[PDB]
C-alpha cells in the first residue's frame, strides 16, 4: 500500500524532451529520496539521479548531469524526471524508486511500475484487434485454443487482460514483434476446456494508452 | 565509479538444486568503521520492476524466503539460492551503494532445467474482419513446451514459406517452467485467396515426428 505510480508510455522525437511523473502515495512524501533508474532493451539497470523530496535537492549521474532535470511537487506528492536532447539510445523503461530505505525502523524498497519511452520520428498508431477463433468441436484431448491478434500499433506497449481480469490461468500474452512496416503486433492466447466454449464468454481487453485506444473483443468459435 | 561484474551471465539448474550467482565490485565496499558491506541483491522478473532480496550483502529483506542467502565481503560477493523453485526464474542483479554514482551489475539470468515436454499446436485462420482491410494474418501457436528451441515451418498448398513469417516466445513459466511460441504468417488478401491449404509444421525435441496443423480457406 505504499505505491509509486508513473505516467503512461510516450513516444518522443530525436532531440526532443520527455517528462515522466511519479506519484508517490501511502507515506510521508517529504521523508525519503526518490531515484530514477532506467533500463534499455536487454540491458542493465542504470541509475540516473535522486531527489530529496523535502529539500528539493538533487544529485545526477555524471552521464546525465547536463541533460536530466528532476523535480518534485510536495502538494501533489509527485516527483518528475525530464530528459532533454533525446537520442534513440534513450529508448528504455524509466523507473522511479524509493531505493533501499534502510532504517532500524524497517528497511523497505519500493519501485514504480516503469514508463516506456521510445525515441522515434514515427507516428502514434492504435492497434486493430482480431479474434483468434477456437473450434467448438469435441476432440480426443478436450482443450481448445482461442485469442486475439493485436496488430499495427506504435509505440510499445499494449496491455492485455481477459474478462476484466477474471481469466488469468492458461493465458499467454506474447512479446510484440516489430513488423517490416515499422508497426508492432502481438497475440494473446489462452487454453480452455472445449466444454466452456459454447457457454463461457471470452473477451480480451486491449489498452494502448499512447493512442488512448481501448478495445474489448468477444472471441467466439 | 564502482563497476559491478557478475558471473555467470546465465545459469540453468534443475528444480530443487542451488543457483550460485557471483558479483565483484571494482573497489572495496566494506566500511571498516561499521563492518558493513554496501551491497544489495535484486531479483527482476519479466514485465516487472526489480525487487529487493538482500542488503548489507547478507541481510534478508522482510518477506524473502530463506533459500535466498547472500555472502562475501570486501569485493567478492555471492547470491546463493539454496533450492531453486519454479517461480525463482528471473534476472538477478547485485548493486553497490558505497559510492556515487549508484551502479548495478549486468544481471544473471536464472532459468530452470526440466524434462522435455512436447508443445500443443493450434492454427488460426485470419478473421474475415481483417481481410476486409486487405491483409491476412495466419497464426500458429505452440503451447507450454520445453526445451525452448522449436522449428515452425509454414507450408501453403504444400509450398515451404520463407521470409513471410514472424515468431515470438514467452519467458519461462513460473509454474511449470515451459515456454509457449507464436508464429504469424502475413499475406496480402490477394496472396491469401490464391491458395487453399494453410499449414504450420512443428518440429521439436518432444515430438518424435513433427506435428502439422492445417486448414482449408
Amino acid at each position: 500500500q505504499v505505491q509509486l505510480v508513473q505516467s503512461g508510455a510516450e513516444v518522443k522525437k530525436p532531440g526532443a524532451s520527455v517528462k515522466v511523473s511519479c506519484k508517490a502515495s501511502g507515506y510521508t512524501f517529504t521523508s525519503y529520496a526518490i531515484h530514477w533508474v532506467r533500463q534499455a532493451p536487454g540491458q542493465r539497470l542504470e541509475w540516473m539521479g535522486w531527489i530529496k523530496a523535502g529539500n528539493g535537492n538533487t544529485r545526477y549521474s555524471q552521464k546525465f548531469q547536463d541533460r536530466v532535470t528532476i523535480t518534485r511537487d510536495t502538494s501533489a506528492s509527485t516527483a518528475y524526471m525530464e530528459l532533454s536532447s533525446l537520442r534513440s539510445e534513450d529508448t528504455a523503461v524509466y523507473y522511479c524508486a524509493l531505493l533501499t530505505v534502510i532504517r532500524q525502523d524497517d528497511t523497505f524498497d519500493i519501485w514504480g511500475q516503469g514508463t516506456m519511452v521510445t525515441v522515434s520520428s514515427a507516428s502514434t498508431k492504435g492497434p486493430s484487434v482480431f479474434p483468434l477463433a477456437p473450434s467448438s468441436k469435441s476432440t480426443s484431448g478436450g482443450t481448445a485454443a482461442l485469442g486475439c491478434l493485436v496488430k499495427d500499433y506504435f509505440p510499445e506497449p499494449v496491455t492485455v487482460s481477459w474478462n476484466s481480469g477474471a481469466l488469468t490461468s492458461g493465458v499467454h500474452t506474447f512479446p510484440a514483434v516489430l513488423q517490416s512496416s515499422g508497426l508492432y503486433s502481438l497475440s494473446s492466447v489462452v487454453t480452455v476446456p472445449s466444454s466452456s466454449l459454447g457457454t463461457q464468454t471470452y473477451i480480451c481487453n486491449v489498452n494502448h494508452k499512447p493512442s488512448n485506444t481501448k478495445v474489448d473483443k468477444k472471441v467466439e468459435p | 565509479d564502482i563497476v559491478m561484474t557478475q558471473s555467470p551471465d546465465s545459469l540453468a539448474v534443475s528444480l530443487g538444486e542451488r543457483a550460485t550467482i557471483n558479483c565483484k565490485s571494482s573497489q572495496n565496499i566494506l566500511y571498516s568503521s561499521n563492518n558493513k558491506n554496501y551491497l544489495a541483491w535484486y531479483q527482476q522478473k519479466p514485465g516487472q520492476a526489480p525487487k529487493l532480496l538482500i542488503y548489507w550483502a547478507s541481510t534478508r529483506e522482510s518477506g524473502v524466503p530463506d533459500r535466498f542467502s547472500g555472502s562475501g565481503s570486501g569485493t567478492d560477493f555471492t547470491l546463493t539460492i539454496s533450492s531453486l523453485q519454479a517461480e525463482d526464474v528471473a534476472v538477478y542483479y547485485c548493486h553497490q551503494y558505497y559510492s556515487s554514482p549508484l551502479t548495478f551489475g549486468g544481471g544473471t539470468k536464472v532459468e530452470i532445467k526440466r524434462t522435455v515436454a512436447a508443445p500443443s499446436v493450434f492454427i488460426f485462420p485470419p478473421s474475415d474482419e481483417q481481410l476486409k482491410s486487405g491483409t491476412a494474418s495466419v497464426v500458429c501457436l505452440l503451447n507450454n513446451f520445453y526445451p525452448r528451441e522449436a522449428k515452425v515451418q509454414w507450408k501453403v498448398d504444400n509450398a515451404l514459406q520463407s521470409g513471410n513469417s514472424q515468431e515470438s516466445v514467452t519467458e519461462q513459466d513460473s509454474k511449470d517452467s515451459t515456454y509457449s511460441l507464436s508464429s504469424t504468417l502475413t499475406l496480402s488478401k490477394a496472396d491469401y485467396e490464391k491458395h487453399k491449404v494453410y499449414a504450420c509444421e512443428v518440429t521439436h525435441q518432444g515430438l518424435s515426428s513433427p506435428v502439422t496443423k492445417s486448414f482449408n480457406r
Binding site: W50, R59, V101 | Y98, S100
Partner: peptide
Amino acid sequence: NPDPNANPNVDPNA
C-alpha cells in the same frame, strides 16, 4: 569511506 550522499535513504548505522 562511503559517500553518504550516494543514496540518502541509507542510514548506515541501522
